[PDB]
Design a binder for this molecule. Structure first.
Ligand SMILES: CC(=O)N[C@@H]1[C@@H](NC(C)=O)[C@@H](OP(=O)(O)OP(=O)(O)OC[C@H]2O[C@@H](n3ccc(=O)[nH]c3=O)[C@H](O)[C@@H]2O)OC[C@@H]1OCc1c(COP(=O)(O)O)cnc(C)c1O
Ligand SMILES: CC(=O)N[C@@H]1[C@@H](NC(C)=O)[C@@H](OP(=O)(O)OP(=O)(O)OC[C@H]2O[C@@H](n3ccc(=O)[nH]c3=O)[C@H](O)[C@@H]2O)OC[C@@H]1OCc1c(COP(=O)(O)O)cnc(C)c1O
Lengths: 370, 371
């Protein structure tokens, strides 16, 4: 099977994990602390904190910003369900705004309209744009819009570590950036994530919330908190991969260019559309959109039988019945709905070569012919 | 240093972790599924779910029971701060009740009185007894009290996997049992935990909440949820240790009796009191209480200089200034406060032998002579 991902953890990292298990510290230790330092340096951001997973990162960002009951946060229609779920979990309401069809990211015009029209009853406190599939498109616009309207911005950069727009590293534009180290995420720790910020007060708050409100001095419990700590052995894995991330992103960009060339016939005859792999895109996922006449579920099944793993890219929040703020049924979300219904992620990861891309395109061509 | 714990992960499990990293599934997979089945069998409970940590287990239990804003949960005064924190995190109020001097567990008579006096304004929905340091004392009474008063019971069994009272395994008495696999917890996965229950509807709810509301026609998102999944390689570690747990607990109980014997001279002259290591205690921590005349922080430091790791056992919730419900401001908590201020955990783990216990007792005797 040509898979959506197939992370290769360096053997020296496996050996380090074994050493840690055999005779090292298991909870967050030197490996996690060094990983944080190295992540911060990589991003050019003041602070990083590693955490249990990318959902945990978003959760902690919301909590550190005192977003909760009585509040609202804008999310894109097209994203993984965690983005909207985690807003609701802290007691806030997820306010859905459509994405644009080119980038698959929160549409800045529709975002402006939502903010402009907002009059409560909840207090609109934040935007949570997703840099979907590694696409940084609109990063700086989101920052500008948040600043214009006095909103916090939490980047859901789950799939976008290493991406950048116009000199701004994704995750670093405003209050918080949140990353995932799920096995689809290029840098993986099995489960894992990170919260980054340039604001030391926010860093200190997240550090408390991550581990029971504990401040080292002996230990003082400063506030109520959670446990979202990453193990030291997970940290070891991640920091072993980080020095390779740029090379892996470069490889993914080359593979994407191969897809762009090989898929042009299918585009020209109208059977699908391509993602727009802009400068700074980290190519975490390569999602096409099939023409309406194809049943996407049947295409996935047929590709599986031809040893190609494919899937939808992400969900349409408005389609799920979970985010029932009044705003969310005042208009339709045609772009996110199209991407949810017709989107098709094709394998693209650093373990593939150009021949593997040709294999996938051959299989897809065959399936869409018959 | 003789340490509070020193987990020995079997080499075969390290090899399995390596195999998983090299060529296996990293997210919750067959190892986690088998671990759940084996945990449930070990406990004689219908269902188990492994999760990121013991705090996550408590969190999910609260959420699955719809405990949140407007509600209240009773917690013991003496516990790790997570117990009371996680109640507050879901929007409920932690209502503190003192512990027993002897067992260090929630005092059933003081529990009864708190429930009797409760008249709001919040809705009192649950008790969250802690089986502290692996002590099962009062497990069945907590169940009986919860049933008598129409309350849910969530066992904070973070430190008590393998403990039992009167034939009931800790974690299995009522709605939920919550365990930790932190490195002090005998069975460790570095970080990890488990939620257990006999109620299939509660099981299904927690499984949804643990992974984004996902139900596997294809995936449906049934409800809003979190990510508290344990990795497949953490699951592999935990299920490798579980078959050893009873033997490790038996070893710990042997060591506890060595402490009891050797510490007797200090007890006799009033320098400290001992824990009561009852039948069914899993001996996750061995916590003494120093006499008031000792500065515990100084004892800890002196012991460290003599290659003995020691610490307080747990915190006093009423002492922290975090749990400010009216009830907690009016009630007094002398027992939990004493255990917080004067408790001293001494190393006790399955990697120690009798010689090591003697070493610790020698060092403590020396320190308390020169204090
Ligand atoms: C774009 C993408 O990668 N989405 C993933 C999402 N998948 C779908 C179909 O929705 C969903 O993945 P999942 O459905 O669980 O798995 P999958 O998409 O079917 O991937 C399976 C494939 O991935 C590979 N894989 C697998 C395991 C593993 O251990 N070895 C491995 O190789 C292998 O090829 C598998 O067949 O969640 C992860 C990813 O999303 C998480 C996420 C989050 C939350 O972050 P975390 O809490 O850290 O997860 C926030 N915010 C955004 C915008 C997010 O995208
Ligand atoms: C009794 C006990 O073991 N308490 C731990 C608690 N410690 C203190 C002093 O409060 C506290 O530990 P900590 O203060 O961080 O560390 P420590 O007590 O000083 O232990 C350090 C020693 O432990 C050993 N250790 C360490 C790492 C590690 O990787 N290798 C290792 O060997 C080693 O000897 C270290 O020096 O948290 C864990 C434990 O409590 C968690 C817990 C929870 C929450 O569960 P989780 O979310 O899974 O944690 C709920 N509910 C209850 C009733 C709980 O007790």
């Amino acid at each position: 099977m040509i898979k959506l991902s197939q992370p290769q953890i360096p053997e020296f990292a496996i050996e380090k994990v074994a050493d840690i298990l055999r005779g090292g510290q298991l909870v967050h230790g030197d490996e996690c602390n060094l990983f944080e330092q190295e992540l911060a340096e990589y991003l050019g951001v003041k602070h990083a904190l590693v955490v249990s997973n990318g959902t945990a990162a978003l959760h902690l960002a919301l909590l550190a910003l005192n977003i909760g009951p009585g509040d609202a946060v804008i999310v894109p229609d097209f994203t993984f369900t965690a983005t909207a779920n985690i807003v609701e979990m802290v007691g806030a309401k997820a306010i859905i705004v459509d994405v644009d069809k080119t980038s698959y990211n929160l549409d800045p015009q529709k975002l402006q309209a939502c903010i402009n029209e907002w009059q409560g009853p909840e207090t609109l406190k934040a935007i949570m744009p997703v840099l979907e599939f590694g696409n940084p498109t609109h990063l700086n616009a989101y920052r500008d819009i948040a600043k214009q309207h006095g909103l916090f911005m939490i980047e859901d950069a789950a799939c976008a570590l290493g991406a950048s727009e116009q000199g701004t590293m994704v995750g670093t534009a405003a209050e918080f950036g949140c990353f995932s180290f799920h096995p689809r995420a290029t840098l993986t720790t099995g489960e894992g994530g990170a919260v980054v910020t340039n604001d030391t007060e926010l860093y200190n708050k997240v550090a408390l919330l991550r581990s029971h409100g504990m401040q080292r001095t002996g230990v003082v419990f400063k506030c109520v908190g959670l446990n979202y700590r990453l193990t030291n052995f997970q940290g070891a894995i991640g920091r072993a991969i980080l020095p390779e991330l740029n090379q892996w992103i470069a490889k993914r960009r080359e593979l994407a260019n191969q897809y762009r060339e090989l898929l042009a016939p299918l585009v020209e005859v109208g059977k699908l559309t391509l993602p727009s792999i802009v400068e700074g895109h980290s190519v975490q996922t390569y999602m096409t959109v099939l023409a309406d006449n194809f049943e996407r579920s049947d295409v996935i099944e047929a590709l599986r039988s031809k040893q190609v793993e494919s899937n939808l890219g992400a969900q349409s929040m408005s389609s799920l019945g979970l985010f029932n703020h009044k705003y969310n049924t005042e208009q339709q979300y045609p772009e996110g709905t199209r991407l949810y219904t017709h989107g098709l992620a094709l394998p693209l990861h650093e373990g593939m070569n150009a021949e593997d891309v040709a294999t996938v395109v051959s299989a897809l061509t065959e399936v869409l012919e018959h």
